[PDB]
Design a protein around this ligand. Structure first.
Ligand SMILES: COC(=O)Nc1ccc2c(c1)NC(=O)CC/C=C/C[C@H](N1CC[C@H](c3cccc(Cl)c3)CC1=O)c1nc-2c[nH]1
Length: 238
């Protein structure tokens, strides 16, 4: 996260850190708890991941230093990538992780509400991007979970900023015209959380951008409201 500040413990209890075990254990991506055996994240996170056996999901983490060999984690039973996914820049950058065990909810780990279909017309004015990603283009994964408040940008304005790309309504953009606050490397897959009527909603999934926090280059997020039926298809299968 560029231009953000340290989160307080329990502030984003749906935020997870997804680690890869191959060749050595390291943070891979962010993710969000959406159900008691379900993490919503970005499809591009699994580039070169040939098995869910190398993945570890850690919930209730503020600091990466809380993670050692004896730290409990959730194993991944299945990786579900959207069928239409090819690359982050073309959309459908969405994936689900079916956990091997159930998350026991508490003040440190609980789900974020998905947006409502009727709320496709609501204007969110209180949106935050979170993660352990870089604070600048050439940096390192941060110990403390960072947060940054970012304004949503219309599809029309985002398309103007990304000449040569096709910004679809299945993408949602967020950023300041002058730049300075954004997601960066290692934040992808994490949430863009917006508070509406005292309730947090998972509006976006950190997907891609041209560099980090650049002037007139808003962050591009998977527009979660456009995938609610797809999420229910995969999580509520009979
Ligand atoms: C000790 O452990 C580490 O050092 N671990 C570590 C470091 C870095 C990264 C990473 C793991 N993960 C991967 O390589 C997995 C595949 C992801 C690829 C794209 C991803 N990304 C690309 C840009 C994207 C963005 C920018 C600006 C605005 C938005 Cl709205 C989104 C944010 C982002 O994380 C990214 N993550 C890393 C590099 N690039």
């Amino acid at each position: 996260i560029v231009g953000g500040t340290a989160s307080v413990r329990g502030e984003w209890p749906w935020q997870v850190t997804l680690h890869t075990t191959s060749p050595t254990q390291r943070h891979l991506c962010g993710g969000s708890i959406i159900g008691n055996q379900w993490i919503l994240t970005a499809a591009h996170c699994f580039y070169g991941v040939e098995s869910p056996k190398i993945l570890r999901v850690y919930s209730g983490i503020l600091n990466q230093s809380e993670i050692k060999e004896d730290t409990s984690f959730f194993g991944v039973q299945e990786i579900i990538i959207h069928d239409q996914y090819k690359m982050a820049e073309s959309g459908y950058d969405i994936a689900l992780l079916k956990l091997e065990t159930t998350v026991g909810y508490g003040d440190s780990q609980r789900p974020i509400c998905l947006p409502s279909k009727g709320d496709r017309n609501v204007i969110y004015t209180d949106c935050w991007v979170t993660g352990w990603g870089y604070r600048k283009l050439r940096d390192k994964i941060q110990n403390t979970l960072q947060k940054a408040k970012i304004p949503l940008v219309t599809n029309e304005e985002c398309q103007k900023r990304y000449r040569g790309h096709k910004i679809t309504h299945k993408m949602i953009c967020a950023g300041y015209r002058e730049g300075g606050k954004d997601a960066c490397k290692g934040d992808s897959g994490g949430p863009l959380s917006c508070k509406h009527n005292e309730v947090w909603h998972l509006v976006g999934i950190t997907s891609w951008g041209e560099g980090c926090a650049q002037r007139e280059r808003p962050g591009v997020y998977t527009n979660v409201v456009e995938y609610v039926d797809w999420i229910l298809e995969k999580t509520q299968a009979v």
